[PDB]
Each structure stands twice: as structure tokens, then as C-alpha cells.
Write an enzyme that holds these catalytic residues in place. Structure first.
Site, short mmCIF file in Angstrom:
data_model
loop_
_atom_site.label_atom_id
_atom_site.label_comp_id
_atom_site.label_asym_id
_atom_site.label_seq_id
_atom_site.Cartn_x
_atom_site.Cartn_y
_atom_site.Cartn_z
N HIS C 96 0.88 -1.16 0.03
CA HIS C 96 -0.35 0.09 -0.10
C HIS C 96 0.53 0.78 0.39
CE1 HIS C 96 -3.22 -3.03 0.99
NE2 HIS C 96 -2.84 -3.25 2.20
N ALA C 179 -14.13 -6.59 -3.19
CA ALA C 179 -15.03 -6.59 -2.26
C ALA C 179 -16.27 -5.60 -2.21
CB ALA C 179 -13.88 -4.92 -1.73
N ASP C 270 -7.75 1.18 3.54
CA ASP C 270 -6.20 0.41 3.14
C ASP C 270 -4.47 1.77 1.74
OD1 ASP C 270 -6.20 -2.48 1.12
OD2 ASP C 270 -7.15 0.02 1.71
N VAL C 298 -10.27 0.04 9.42
CA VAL C 298 -9.37 -0.99 10.08
C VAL C 298 -9.00 -1.28 8.67
CG1 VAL C 298 -8.86 -3.00 10.84
CG2 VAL C 298 -10.60 -1.39 12.20
N1 LIG Z 1 -9.30 -2.75 5.11
C1 LIG Z 1 -8.82 -3.83 4.49
O1 LIG Z 1 -8.84 -5.10 5.11
C2 LIG Z 1 -8.83 -4.32 2.68
C3 LIG Z 1 -8.22 -5.40 2.54
C4 LIG Z 1 -8.73 -5.64 1.37
C5 LIG Z 1 -8.72 -4.91 0.52
N2 LIG Z 1 -8.92 -3.84 1.07
C6 LIG Z 1 -9.56 -2.58 -0.08
O2 LIG Z 1 -10.92 -2.41 -0.47
C7 LIG Z 1 -10.41 -1.89 -2.23
C8 LIG Z 1 -11.48 -1.89 -3.06
O3 LIG Z 1 -10.63 -3.66 -3.66
P1 LIG Z 1 -11.07 -4.66 -4.50
O4 LIG Z 1 -10.29 -6.07 -4.77
O5 LIG Z 1 -12.40 -4.66 -4.25
O6 LIG Z 1 -11.31 -3.47 -6.27
P2 LIG Z 1 -11.89 -3.57 -7.67
O7 LIG Z 1 -10.53 -3.60 -8.67
O8 LIG Z 1 -12.32 -5.62 -7.91
O9 LIG Z 1 -12.79 -2.75 -7.72
C9 LIG Z 1 -12.74 -1.35 -7.50
C10 LIG Z 1 -13.91 -0.64 -7.94
O10 LIG Z 1 -14.33 0.49 -7.31
C11 LIG Z 1 -15.04 1.07 -8.53
N3 LIG Z 1 -14.32 2.97 -8.79
C12 LIG Z 1 -13.24 3.92 -8.70
N4 LIG Z 1 -13.00 4.87 -9.07
C13 LIG Z 1 -14.39 4.96 -8.60
C14 LIG Z 1 -15.27 6.18 -8.54
N5 LIG Z 1 -14.21 7.37 -8.35
N6 LIG Z 1 -16.82 5.82 -8.70
C15 LIG Z 1 -17.33 4.72 -8.16
N7 LIG Z 1 -16.39 3.72 -8.41
C16 LIG Z 1 -15.49 3.75 -8.39
C17 LIG Z 1 -13.81 0.78 -9.51
O11 LIG Z 1 -14.83 0.94 -11.61
C18 LIG Z 1 -14.03 -1.33 -9.02
O12 LIG Z 1 -14.33 -1.88 -10.17
C19 LIG Z 1 -9.08 -1.66 -2.32
O13 LIG Z 1 -9.01 0.00 -1.81
C20 LIG Z 1 -8.61 -2.34 -1.23
O14 LIG Z 1 -7.44 -2.33 -1.04
C21 LIG Z 1 -9.32 -3.53 2.29
#
Ligand SMILES: NC(=O)c1ccc[n+]([C@@H]2O[C@H](COP(=O)([O-])OP(=O)(O)OC[C@H]3O[C@@H](n4cnc5c(N)ncnc54)[C@H](O)[C@@H]3O)[C@@H](O)[C@H]2O)c1
Ligand SMILES: NC(=O)c1ccc[n+]([C@@H]2O[C@H](COP(=O)([O-])OP(=O)(O)OC[C@H]3O[C@@H](n4cnc5c(N)ncnc54)[C@H](O)[C@@H]3O)[C@@H](O)[C@H]2O)c1
Ligand SMILES: [Mg+2]
Ligand SMILES: [Mg+2]
Ligand SMILES: [Mg+2]
Lengths: 368, 365, 373, 368, 373
Positions: C96, C179, C270, C298
Site C-alpha cells: 500500500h 470488495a 488501506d 480498519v
Molecule cells: N481494509 C482492509 O482490510 C482491506 C482488505 C482488502 C482489500 N481492501 C481494499 O478494498 C478496496 C477495494 O478493492 P477491490 O479488490 O474491490 O477492487 P476492485 O478493483 O475489484 O473494485 C474497485 C472498483 O471501484 C470502482 N471505482 C473506482 N473509482 C470509482 C469512483 N470514482 N466512483 C465509483 N466507483 C469507482 C472501479 O470501477 C472498480 O469496479 C481496495 O482499496 C483494497 O485494497 C482493504
């Protein structure tokens, strides 16, 4: 730059080429948005709604056309507008140039730069601005077909889903593409027995998986089609490609009296031999003992849904064109470049040029 | 005995009171079935279909009426038919006597024995012969709602299920009975977001279980009902009537919103309802569209004929086998439909609605 | 080579970066596996488990780092670990970097070679190592959001699914990728009315098909986002631009318009959070107030379900781990374009363009360190 | 008291009248359970499983019958077991006494008190100890129907669910009772197109709601039934007093070559004209160009499932007989009392009495 | 008459026994409504809202109890309220008497007339006033079970739904009535593998039909129950015999054989608990250890979602309230056998057979108290 959206002028066209969401985003990026007073009234967007989002509302059609650098519309300009076309303006709308020499020639003679929604095309071959109109038409086909199945409308008198103990309508959808899949899903949600025919077995696999076999799928041969059509209460023609003629008048003659045929492929000749475009006031006509429904521009009938569906799809292209101009926007995005239609008298579409017997100018040469 | 089925003659009535299934069963049992030629055609049943099942196809309505011991119909006899009514014939049909003294007087003057489909009533209080018509009408209310929501019909311009990224229609069904359940189900299947209002929490609880929460249920307080209606693109009134939607509530609705009154056969459940026809199905009330056509099920006679006659079949068979008195003695539900016999009115509710004398059904059984 | 796995040290991080099956395989291919004693206890993998698989167990974190050629971790190195970062070691973990100028600095200054799990990216655009963790985080977001909606947790006091006759919670999910899809799915399974926004209409079509319209979908414009957020009882922020810091989509100004006791779970924390008011929080103290709402931010969500998430993660990473151990970083990256996209630092060079341009740090082409001779 | 369970001795009966769960509950309440060594092995219950639950395993059938105050069985006593019947013992099992004068007379001559599973009946009329066996039979009928539809088994050679592009089996279920609902359900899960026929419209309403229109429903009349059967690849006869002959051999003559008909009603005469009971090894025979499957006691084919389904059902009744003896249990539970068949040479079923022409002794006279 | 609604005083009890529309309906009928200032605040109903509707707002709990002819409450009176119980007053609330000799004695010694929501019973056997609360508690049981399965809560550290490739949580629900069905349904919606046990095989057939076999069903015997519980990550106890003390189906020695970190939620704690080790916990301190397992035993679960549960409750109770106000308890019970089944105490007589049996206390036939003269 200045983005202008005039009121649609085609008889029964109620959609508009932008919504307040769109106005807000253009405005936020330092574009000025000019909208003709009343333009969104068909779609249940008020002048107040558009002004709140940031638009300047203008009294006249010609002020919008005279002042905009980018002109957004839903349909192609008509005769009353030809004198409004100009050099140095980018027109972004559904054009269907192959269907109208008058339109094409008006655009070429004006010197205008035009880009057609329907030929914008991503590398996988999809048509992302046409897609939402296909979804809406597919969905409407099912509703409109259920309604004309009523005996008070000249139909066989069969309710889509029947009722317990009683047989549901037998619905046949020709084509498993976007419209087709949407027509089938709604006719199925209405309780009809739906069979979808396609020669793309992968598309039939998707249906089989998505409805877990509830929607029947049959490999589309002429032989299978004839049999399915003879048993149908409702036929939905959803073949996108000119559309081939898959349902002959001979075949219609062997259909159940009062069967309804809904031709979605009407925006390209129809996929039934007997199809001829209709209007809202006279939507259907008889062929043999059967009922044909073939209204042009089906999505215009649901403007609040269609306006949003269309403009959510066009918005990112609109934004790129406003931010970067037509040449640079087209150079960055080959999908946008595939929609390029005219520029300073050059016809930039090989399909239109050969249909019309007009010199073709290669798009590449105008982007340099 | 001879069972007779004439063509329906009311304007826009295309159903028929028997199908080939029913004729085969009557025939199997040694009854003769007489049907007016063309009677099934509005329901897509040909004379040849009926004949292959065992019917005798007779040329005139007069002959069917003259010769039938049991006369099956869909709708009440109308003026032109009054001369056909006769003593010693059992008429079995929808009658709605409390809505027509003329029809009541006709049946009384004729001396006929008649039983009303709509007051046949099982011990649990259900009306088994009306039930299929409420099922049909609920499903239709969804289809017809959807069509007049189109801007070209003068509705707001909203597609039922929207499309991805776009808002579906907001649909409110008032009443969780047979019709309402069926309206909710079709509208949900078309992709609309559906809310059902009712004060019977148990019915709300069955809708919640059946569709796993997908159909929204709100207990029908004045606050819930008004809020739901003001947010709706489509309102289906399905309370079988009190006036739940006032004209001033309608004043606050979204322009071009559609209101479909299924209750219109019993006065309608919207203040502004008046009954309407197939030629002109809708009218304006404020910036809103009211759809109030009567006898909605008549619109789909192929479906409605079968729905209805599947429901009537067991009673038809018992009337044929055993005659009206033995059948009514054996089945109190059938007896609840008794209307007239040999000049006497057998319904206390009709008698008091029309201010006419009344003979206790038990007199004649 | 020697591959090393130290005990995770982040707040409440119970995951581990390898399981016994992974060690047996590495060991079978003739590698030495070094594990810090206790490393797997949070995932109920005992030292005896790891030892029977072929691992040498080591008393100190310092020794694991010093002796490992390939160092496998779950989370990014924290401040107390910056001094363990080594030139000539490969670090393979969640980084990250766009979210941390300080973590990027330490990697660059150490000379280490780092590859981020979350930027490993296959031809089709998918992120196979982030995917399972986004699956877990999204499922958790729905249950955690539901729990905080309880009046006893300071929330609004609304039940996720309602009960018959009574409205359910209104849940807005921003992002329809891994997610957001999983958050929407679980929230919908708990009975809530779920609306999902994304700018990618194909992701919205997928959701519309999977739940036959039951989960609502809206094209994500600022105009539509604000309307939806003002109506929401629970908002789940789940957007991503791969390797980039999250765009700030929900302004503190918008939050001021929300229903009192509304809950905002920022899964994108993250990568820096997609809400203006987001700041990293901890399983020990997971929430804080913004205006009259409650934020949950978190950055190691799957840590609390390590019996699920240790396995989900290692099922995905282990094939890449094997290529790195067998062939080394450069050869493995050359052979696999997807692994190469994970390349983040080498010998003081920042190899990620988005990170570089998000941090205002100079960028070095990855192809330049992989170029043939 | 002492509860005895012997091994079933009828040919191909592999079920057993108690599970470990049942043994443990009886044992916890202070009853002694005696079970013939090897009795549960057809249902995958080892003597060790019973022993662990508290049973005492005994070498011989003779000893179980001699020492049990309550004797639980699955099937009726056969000729070789008649001399094991006794005064002072309660026998609780499927009896079907009307189908057997030899069994009825044996029970009466012995003086034993017997109670029939199949006549235990609650006040809504339901048959709760028969219900689990109907559930099993119905589900099995779908699976065996599928198997004998294979051309290698003599059937038409049609896969239940088809595959994308290809037509599924057309399955007709006659009767929407417990067996029919269950068959419709599995056959639909296998991907077949299922139509259920019944004259009870509220049963059709329930199917329509439970599967959302997917399982078709038709009001049953001979005319509808003929049409449906003529289109079927598979017909399941699930009509539950003797069963009516609903499918004539004449109708079978007009069926599709290789159609399969499974008669679940075979254990009360069958509901097909051509039905006659069959066995596991010769399960099918031809009628005209059609294949009939008529195996008696289908639930015996899956003893692990059926043992548990049945003994789950009987368990509360067994517990009362054990806790309270037959007289007090029957007085307190009118459902159990309806199962009363014999006691000290009195025949307590009026239906059986009239069917065999034996004196009928009022159950009330014995319950006092 | 004067209908009085005091503020609830049980730990974290945010529900209130009436809504502004309830008050308007009573006031329209000619009744005076007394409400303790603040009584609705936990349900976001302000004093002003109540005053607007027609209520008299009174400053003290003592005045409400002293003046009210009909006293509406959500939960049973607690020790501090025992002195407020009055002869000649009707108390209408959840009582749970089989579970408290102390509460019973207080009602009896005061001579008050009490009617329990939870034993009001229609002729089909349904408990229409318990039902809405059972729906809320069942749905909550699933979300709080999932929460305490997290390793950060002392749980086993398993995600309800797992993720692809990785096993979900194993959930056992005991009782397939209102609360059991709702807990199973929400648990299944979260992706858990759910097994429901009941001794009513008809309730199993309903679950089987509704989820087409996805929710597993098992006939409840001791033997089945102990196999199922030993394999469970989460056990939800949802059994009832109407008005009776819950049976103990889950012994402490069974708990000893469960998985370390398993979570057991006893919804039936309001009637004494169906686990041997159960005892009433509180929203402040909801869990405690039994062997290596976590017990959750909150007897007012729906209190945490008052925006949902206050309306769900009052939607059901209000028709009965109106009949009590209009006609007095005796006439109302005479007219309505369902309401009569709720009758619990009157002038020192215990009118509930099950409670009398369970407490070892003399039973007075309710028809004697309803007899004509
Ligand atoms: N907090 C945690 O413990 C943890 C753990 C795992 C993943 N995550 C995070 O969750 C987030 C999502 O991951 P993912 O695997 O779902 O990604 P992903 O690429 O599969 O999906 C992200 C989506 O967001 C959309 N998007 C981007 N900009 C946008 C906007 N301006 N308006 C509306 N939609 C928009 C994209 O089109 C995409 O479909 C990432 O930051 C990932 O690192 C956090
Ligand atoms: N803790 C709380 O805040 C709270 C709130 C609401 C309801 N509840 C409680 O939840 C409990 C369940 O209520 P409900 O409405 O679901 O009741 P219900 O009657 O609808 O269902 C109870 C079920 O338990 C089954 N059962 C009884 N004995 C059994 C046994 N020996 N083994 C297996 N199953 C058995 C019954 O057959 C029945 O189906 C009640 O005690 C109720 O008071 C608690
Ligand atoms: Mg740009
Ligand atoms: Mg007992
Ligand atoms: Mg009154």
C-alpha cells in the site's frame, strides 16, 4: 468549452442528451453548459433541476446551436435543423447515416464534425452507447407484448404468467444478445414459458446458467425456429447484426390466431418479412390472423429510464470530448474514433460511404 | 341431464362458461352438453374442439336456453335474454343481484332456479369462484400498470425494472389479499421495487417469507400509507370498498404516476375512481393517471375462461349428477350461492339491499 | 534459497504469510524455510505444525530478516521494522505504498527489492492476490456495519433486514468490484436494501444479473453518490484504482447531511480512504465520530478471521512464492508479467508509476531493471 | 418397559425400526432396549452403534420377541414370525391388514395388541407416520425415472435437464400430495420441465408459489391428463382406500415410444391400468411401447435415509407407548388410538373388519 | 381511563411501549395518556412528539405508576419498580414469569392485574405479540454470533460465509419457530452452513421448502443435538414452550467437547436459557466463558435496534391496548380468548398454569376470575 443540448424535435421524441448529474460534472470541470428551456420536460427534468446543476437555460434552439462547441443530441438532426449545423462544432448523437442521404449530405455540406453514438465500439466489438438502448427495448418488448396479448387489443387473450392450474403464455425470443436477453428475463419474471433461440451456444449457456434452466434455450436453425414460432403466443424479434428476415409471412400464416409479434430489430429493417415501422398512435397491424408490433424508437416511450440509461453511457465520452477536443479525444480512444462520421466535408465512415456511393476519407488521415 | 352453455352477449365479454375438459367429463357421466355455435371463439375454443369433446353444437341461443336443465354462464343475463329465463332450469353464473333490481326482477318473474358464482363460499369464508378472477386481475394490474407508465400513454415515462445503473419503478400495492399478492408478484418479477401495505401483519409476514424480503412490507399506518404513495410511480389498489387514497393525497404524487384500481368492481378504493372502459381506460386526476376498467379478467378470456371453469367444475358436476337440491344439501358452500327459486329470493343480503321480501334458503332445502 | 516468515506485528494481525503445506512444498524443492516462533499461533498453526512441515523455528524477528533471501509477510513493514529491511532481500507482502510516504522512504533507503501482493495483476486486469482479501474485507464490512448500527454501539438503532411491516436498513456500497460485490451480497443476505454505485457499467450489469435486480445499481456520479449517501443508514467505501491512493468521494460536508447515527465503513482506508474524514483505525479502537455519524477505518480487516483469511491468502500467493524461491525475483518477473506488475522497489528505485506520481517521488521504469543483456 | 427391535425378515427389507438416537432416548428414560444382532446393518447401523447408545444386542429373533413388552417393526409379521406373536405384547409396525387375511388372523389368534403406523392419524386428517415414506418414495421416483429414461435401460434416451440448446425431459406428475410434491421438486431440480396435475387448486397454488411458476400446474381432468401424458417423457403416478386407474392402457398406446411411467401408488393397487407390483432385480416391464416401473416399497431401496425418516416420525409415539403403556397412551392421544388394530382377539379397525367380513369391535369398548 | 407509559429501566433498554400514533388513537377515544418525560428518547420519539399526539408529559416514574389505570411497558418490572406495582392497575408488558420467582412474588403480593405479551395466544397457537420480538432477536442472533466469532472478540476467528475455496462457519440453530427461522435465515444469508433442529417435523418441512434444502434440517433428539453442537462454530438456542421455563438441552459437559472459540447465543435466556451454563448477561457485558467457549445471553436483545423494534412491537400490541383501554381487562378478556391467555396475575392469584407448575406455586383457573355473576 461550451456544451449545448437542444430540445429533441422529432415527433414523439421525449429523451434529452444530458441529465443534471452530467451538467454538474461538466460544470465542475469548468465547462459551460447551455440547455434549451424545456429540453428535459419529457424526461421529467425541469429547467430548475438543470439550472441547479449549473446550466445556462436559453430560450431558443438556434442560440444553443450557435453558441455550443459541443452539441449533444439523442437523435439525428432533421430538416428544420439542417440550417443550424456548422463548421467547428462537434455533433454527438445517434446518426444512422446509412438510412438517410439527406442527413449525411446536410452534415457533409455544413462542414461539421460529427460522431455517431451507435458506431462507438470497444475492441471486443461491443457497442457501449447502443447497449443501454438495447436493454430498454428488450425490457419494453416484454411489457408491450404482454399488453397486446390482451383480447381487447386484438391479441389471443392470454395472460403472460397464467394463474395456478392454467397455462402461461408461450414466449419465443429470437436472439440472445442484449435486447434478446433482456426481453427474455422480463417475460420470464412475468411467469411466461420463455424459449430463446440463438446460434451462439455460449450465449445459450449464459442463459442456462443465469436462470438455472428456467429459460429454455434452443439452437436456432430454420427448422427449430419454425417449430417454436408455430407454438408461440408471443414472438420477440431481437436479432442484432441489415437485419435478416427470419420469420416469413408463410410462417406467420401457420401461427396461432391472435399471436403477437414484437419486432425490436425494426431500427434496421426488421427481422420479420412482414414488419414495417409503426408509430405510437398506430402501434400494431395485422398480418394474417396475427398481430405485429413494430414501433420505431421504442426506448423513447420511457424517457425517464432511457435518458438516464443513454447519458450514463455517453457521459465519459462527453467528458473526454469537452476536456480534450474531438481530435485528441479520438486519438486517445480508438472506441470513440470508430464513431467519427464527418469532418469538414469528409465522410469518415467506410460503411456509409459504400452504402451511399460517396467518396470515403480514411479517419486516420483526419486525425493527422 | 342436459347442460347448456350459450354465447356471452354482454359487450366485451368473450369468456365462455365451459371448456372441452368440462364437456368431456359431463359426457363421460352421461349428461348431454349443448353449446351455442361460436360460444368458445372469444376464448380461442373452436366449435370443433367442443364437438370432439362430446358437445352438440346448436345454431341458436334460444334452443340452448329452451333445452338445458342446467344453464352455465359467465355474466348475469341482460335485457335481451330475460325472455329466455325459465322455471325448472338451474342458472349458474356471476349475478351480482344487489347491483341490479331489473335482473333480480327478471329472475323472480321467470321462476328460474339460480345460484350466484360469487356468493358460493367455503366454511373458512373464502369465495372459491371469485378467487381465480382476483388472481387474474392482480396479475393483469401489473402488466397494465407497466404499459400506462409509458410516456406515450400519458404516464411518467418509467420502465418497471429499469436497467443496470438506472432506477426501477417504485410500485405500491395496497392490500395483501389474493389480488394484491398477485399484483405484487408480477410487478416484482418485472423488476419494479415493490412495497405491499396491509394491516394484517400475518399476511405481511407470509409475503416476507415467500420472497425473502425482496417484496417490501409496511404495516399500513396513515404515515406509512401516505409516504409510500407519494414516492410511487405505480399504485395498485387491491383492497376487497373503503377509500384509502384521497384526492388530496393524489395532489402530492409525482406527475404522471399511475393508479390502477382493482377494487373498481366494488366502488373502487381510491377517492377519485369511477369505472372506465377498454376504449377509454384512463383519465386524469390532478397530474396522475387513473386506470379503472371493470371486469379486467374479460381482457384475457383464454386464461380467464379456464381459471373460472376449473373452479366451477366440481360444482357443475355435482349439480348435473344430483340436481340443485341434493347438491345444495350435500354442500353448504354451493348452498350459499342460492339466489332465486320459483319466484322467491333466497338471499337475505340482496333482499335487504333492494328492500324486497326474502325467503330463507332453508325453506327450500 | 532461504525463505523467511516473521510474526506479524501490526495491531491485532493474526494472519501468517505461509502454512505447513507451503513449507512442505518449499522444503521439497530444496529451499530452507525459516519461521519466527509463534508466527502461526494467531491462525492456530503451532510451531510443531510448522516444524513437522520442514521449517527451522527461530527465536528472534531480527534473525528471520537477516537470514532470509525471500521474506514473506502479510502486511507492510511498520516503523519498528524499518531497521530490519535489507539490501539484497526480496520482500513479498501487502505494501500500500501510495498510502505511506514513510514506508516507501524506508524501503527505498534500505535498498530492498519489494513486490506488492496488491499490484500483482493478470492480463485481464484482475488482482489475484488482493482478491481473496477483498473478499474477506467486503464480507466483514457488512457484518461490522450491521453491528455498529446498533444503538448500543452509538449507531442509529436500525436492524439490517427490518422485520415484516417495518423498513430495513438502507445500505449504499461505493464500488462494485471484489470488495463491494461481497459487501453488497452479504448486506443483501442480511435483508438490507442495497444500492451499489460504480463508474464501470459492466460491473453493474453483473450485479444486476446475479441478484436479478434485487441489489440496486446506480451509475456513480457525484450527483448520484450524494443523493444515495444522504439516504443511507450504512455506507461502505470499496473503490480502487490499482496501486493508487483512493479518491476522496464522500466529503465531510456531505457527512454533515447524513442521518444521525449513520455508519460509514471505509474499506479503501488501506489505500488512504475514499471518505474525506477517514483516518486509519485499529481493531482495539475501530471507530470515531464525524459530525453525527460513525466512521470505521480498519486497514487490516481480514486479520480478525485468520482461520479463513490465512488460508484464503496463501492459496493465492503460494504459486508466486514458489516461482520467486526457485528462480529469484528478476527471472520470476521476466517469466511472469503478472508478478512483474507487483514490482515496487529495487536498490533505491521506485518502480511504480502511480505511487511515484501520487507521492511526488521520481519514477524508474520496471522494464529497465528487467531488461536483457 | 422392555422395547424389542428384531431384524426385518421380508425379502429386500433393509430398514430397521429404531436408530441409535431412539435407543438413547428410551434408555435415558429408564427403558431397556433389546435389538437383534445385525438388525441395523442394512441401514448402515452397526451393533456397536446401538450398543453405545444403550441397547442390549441379542443373538436371536426368538429372544427379542419373547422379552419385549413393546415390539417395533417396519413391516408386517410374515408367516415364519406368526408363532412369535403373543398376548401381553404391544406390536407397532406397518400392518396393511386389509391386504392380508393371513396376517390379520394371526394377530387375532395370538391375542397380541397391535397398532398400525399407516392408520395413526391427526385431526387434520394427515398421516404423520406414512408421510416420511411418501416423501422418500416421491423423491426416489424422480431419480429412478431419470435412470430408466436412459436408452440403455429401455427408455426413450432423454436426459432430465437437457443441455443448453437442447430440450429437457417433459415430466408429468399426477397428484400434488406429499409424494407428488416431492417428485415434482426433485425432477425440477434435475432440470426437467415439470407439470403437476391435481384437482385441489390450493395444492396447485402452493406449488406455484413455492417454485414461482417454474413447476407448471394444471387442473386435473381426464382430458387435461390425456394431453399431458401424451407429451410426457416421464409420468409419475402419485395419487394417494384403493387408488383410481387414471392412465388406461389405451392412453399408454398413444404415448411416446420409450416413455417411462413410475407408479408410486403400486402399494395400493397402482394408479395405471397396466401396473403390477415389481421387484428390484426386475423393476420394469413393457406396456405397448412404454416402460413401467412398479417396485413395491421403494423406500426400502434407501434404508439409511428411510430408517431415519420413519423412526424420526414414530419416535414420539414409541416414547409414549413405552412411558405409559398402550391403554393410557391411546386414551391421551387420539392420533395413536386411530392406529389401533387388534387386542386380545378383537379387530379394532372398521375398514378392515368390513373389508374382510370379520366382527368389528369398537376401539372405545377396549379403551375402558 | 388513564393509560401510562413509563421510561424503560432495564439495562440499555431503548424501546418504548407506545408511539405518537398510539397516543393519538387513545386520545381520540377519550383516554388520557400519561408518559414519563424522556420515555421515547431511545426510540427517537421526543417529548414534543408525544405531547403533539395528545399525551400528558409527567416528570417522574412514580407519578406514571400511581396515576395509570393501564400501565404499558416493554419489559418485566425490575426490583426498583416492585414498590410501584399497584392493586387495581392493569400491567401489560413482557413478563417471563417462569424465569423469575421474584418478579412473580412481587406481582402477586401487590395484587396487581398483569397480562403478559408473550402468552397472548390465538387459537392457531401463534403468539402474535412475542412474534415481532422473536423476529428481531433471531435476526440479531446471526449478526452478533458472526461478530463474536471474530478473533478480536475472543472468538474462533472464522468468517460466517467463508470465501471461495475456504470453508464457511458451521451454524446450529435449536428451534425452528419464529426466532430460529429468522436466525437461520440471516445466518444463511451471510453464507454460513446452517443446520436447524426441532421436534416439530412440520417446522422442518417449512424450512426445507423455503430454502429448497439449503438450510439443513435435523429432527431434534439428544443424540443428534450433541453431534451437531460438537461440530458448530456457532450455536443459537431458540426453543420455546409457551409461558414455560426453557428446557436445558445443551449441557456444560457437551460444551466441554466443543471447538475452542465457539460462540453460543441463547435467545431463550428470557425464559431461563436452554443451555445449562446460561445466565442473563447485559448489553454492557454480553459474554462470558464456559470452558473454551463464549456464551451470549442478553434477555432484551431487541433493545439495541429500537427504530425497528419499537414499531414492530407497537404494531402488534396496539389493537389489544385499545380494547383494554376501552373496556377494562375483564370485559376485554371475556370478548377475546387470545388476550385472556395472557392473563398472569390478579389480586394475588396466579392465572398461568405453566408458570404455576414451573414455580411450584398455586394455580388459579383464569375462568374463575372471568366468571359472570
Ligand atoms: N481494509 C482492509 O482490510 C482491506 C482488505 C482488502 C482489500 N481492501 C481494499 O478494498 C478496496 C477495494 O478493492 P477491490 O479488490 O474491490 O477492487 P476492485 O478493483 O475489484 O473494485 C474497485 C472498483 O471501484 C470502482 N471505482 C473506482 N473509482 C470509482 C469512483 N470514482 N466512483 C465509483 N466507483 C469507482 C472501479 O470501477 C472498480 O469496479 C481496495 O482499496 C483494497 O485494497 C482493504
Ligand atoms: N432474548 C431476547 O431478547 C428475546 C426476544 C424475543 C424472543 N425471545 C425468545 O426466543 C424464544 C423462542 O421464541 P419463538 O417465538 O421462536 O418461539 P416459537 O414457539 O415460535 O418456536 C419455538 C420452537 O422451539 C421448538 N422446541 C420446543 N422444545 C424443543 C426441544 N425440546 N428441542 C428442539 N426444539 C424444541 C418448538 O417446537 C418450536 O418450533 C422464546 O423463549 C422467546 O421468549 C427472546
Ligand atoms: Mg482527461
Ligand atoms: Mg409422558
Ligand atoms: Mg370496543
Amino acid at each position: 468549452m461550451r456544451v449545448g443540448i437542444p430540445t429533441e424535435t422529432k415527433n414523439n421524441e421525449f429523451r434529452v442528451a444530458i441529465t443534471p448529474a452530467g451538467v454538474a460534472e461538466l460544470t465542475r470541470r469548468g465547462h459551460e453548459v447551455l440547455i434549451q428551456a424545456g429540453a428535459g420536460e419529457g424526461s421529467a427534468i425541469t429547467d430548475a433541476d438543470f439550472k441547479a446543476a449549473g446550466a445556462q437555460l436559453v430560450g431558443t434552439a438556434d442560440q444553443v446551436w450557435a453558441d455550443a462547441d459541443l452539441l449533444l443530441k439523442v437523435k439525428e438532426p432533421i430538416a428544420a435543423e439542417y440550417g443550424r449545423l456548422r463548421h467547428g462544432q462537434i455533433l454527438f448523437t445517434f446518426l444512422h447515416l446509412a438510412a438517410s442521404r439527406a442527413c449525411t449530405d446536410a452534415l457533409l455540406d455544413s462542414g461539421t464534425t460529427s460522431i455517431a453514438y451507435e458506431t462507438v465500439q470497444t475492441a471486443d466489438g461491443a457497442l457501449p452507447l447502443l447497449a443501454p438502448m438495447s436493454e430498454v427495448a428488450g425490457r419494453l418488448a416484454a411489457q408491450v407484448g404482454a399488453y397486446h396479448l390482451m383480447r381487447t387489443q386484438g391479441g389471443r387473450g392470454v395472460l403472460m404468467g397464467g394463474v395456478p392450474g392454467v397455462e402461461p403464455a408461450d414466449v419465443v425470443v429470437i436472439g440472445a444478445g442484449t435486447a434478446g436477453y433482456n426481453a427474455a428475463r422480463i417475460a420470464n419474471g412475468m411467469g411466461a414459458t420463455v424459449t430463446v433461440l440463438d446460434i451462439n451456444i455460449d450465449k445459450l449457456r449464459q442463459l442456462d446458467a443465469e436462470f438455472c434452466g428456467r429459460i429454455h434455450t434452443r439452437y436456432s436453425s430454420a427448422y427449430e425456429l419454425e417449430g417454436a414460432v408455430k407454438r408461440a403466443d408471443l414472438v420477440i424479434g431481437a436479432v442484432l447484426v441489415k437485419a435478416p428476415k427470419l420469420v416469413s409471412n408463410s410462417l406467420v400464416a401457420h401461427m396461432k390466431p391472435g399471436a403477437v409479434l414484437v419486432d425490436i430489430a425494426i431500427d434496421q429493417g426488421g427481422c420479420f418479412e412482414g414488419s414495417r415501422p409503426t408509430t405510437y398512435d398506430h402501434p400494431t397491424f395485422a398480418v394474417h390472423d396475427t398481430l405485429f408490433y413494430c414501433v420505431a424508437n421504442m426506448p423513447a416511450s420511457v424517457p425517464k429510464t432511457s435518458t438516464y440509461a443513454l447519458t450514463n453511457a455517453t457521459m465519459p465520452y462527453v467528458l473526454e470530448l469537452a476536456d480534450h477536443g474531438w481530435r485528441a479525444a479520438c486519438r486517445s480512444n480508438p472506441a470513440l474514433a470508430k464513431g467519427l462520421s464527418t469532418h469538414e466535408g469528409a465522410l469518415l465512415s467506410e460503411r456509409v460511404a459504400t452504402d451511399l456511393g460517396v467518396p470515403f476519407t480514411e479517419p486516420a488521415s483526419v486525425l493527422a
